[PDB]
Amino acid sequence: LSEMYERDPCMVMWWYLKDEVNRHFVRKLKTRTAPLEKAWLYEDSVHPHAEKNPRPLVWTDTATMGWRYKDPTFQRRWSPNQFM
């Protein structure tokens, strides 16, 4: 992830949006990307969008816990499943 950060820090962020937009909208290729091209990644604060007046995002992180790394391609094969 750091060797990817040398190349472009914005790509480290774009890789993860793709993983949350492809968390439901994988089905058809038009809705797989059309959201992705709605966010604007900037490795620093200066950005051309004062003319759009981006309203701040009143949001505090919910999970104080850390991020586990779960392999894409991890298969759960049985769930807790009341019928056991």
Binding site: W14, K18, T33, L41, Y42
Partner: protein, 122 residues
């Protein structure tokens, strides 16, 4: 179109619009510093400038000389090329044939004073 190819076919005209912005703003900062005071911090000294770095000759952790090369092309000098005519070339350059067979470097202490700055190797 792949993933990484996508991110650029989306962000290629999004970085250009970003840097072309700063320059377009760089002209704005270049204005309100005309009537303003000599220079603030303002990301350096805040003309469109590049300060010089006397810190470029290093001896690395392995004890070997590492020089940083920094070239600062002047936007006013380059346009002063694309208008004027270059001078007639000196005849001692072209009428002379460039040597083919660059020969290896020979070590040498400079003069009768053994300064020489390699620290050694014997």
């Amino acid at each position: 179109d792949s993933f990484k190819e996508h991110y650029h076919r989306v962000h290629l005209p999004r970085r250009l619009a970003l840097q072309r912005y700063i320059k377009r703003e760089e002209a704005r900062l270049s204005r309100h510093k005309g009537k303003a005071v000599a220079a603030a911090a303002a990301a350096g000294v805040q003309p469109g400038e590049v300060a010089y770095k006397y810190n470029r000759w290093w001896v690395s952790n392995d004890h070997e000389f590492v020089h940083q090369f920094a070239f600062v092309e002047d936007p006013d000098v380059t346009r002063e090329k694309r208008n004027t005519l270059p001078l007639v070339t000196k005849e001692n350059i072209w009428k002379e044939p460039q040597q083919t067979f660059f020969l290896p470097f020979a070590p040498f202490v400079r003069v009768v004073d053994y300064a020489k700055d390699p620290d050694t190797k014997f």
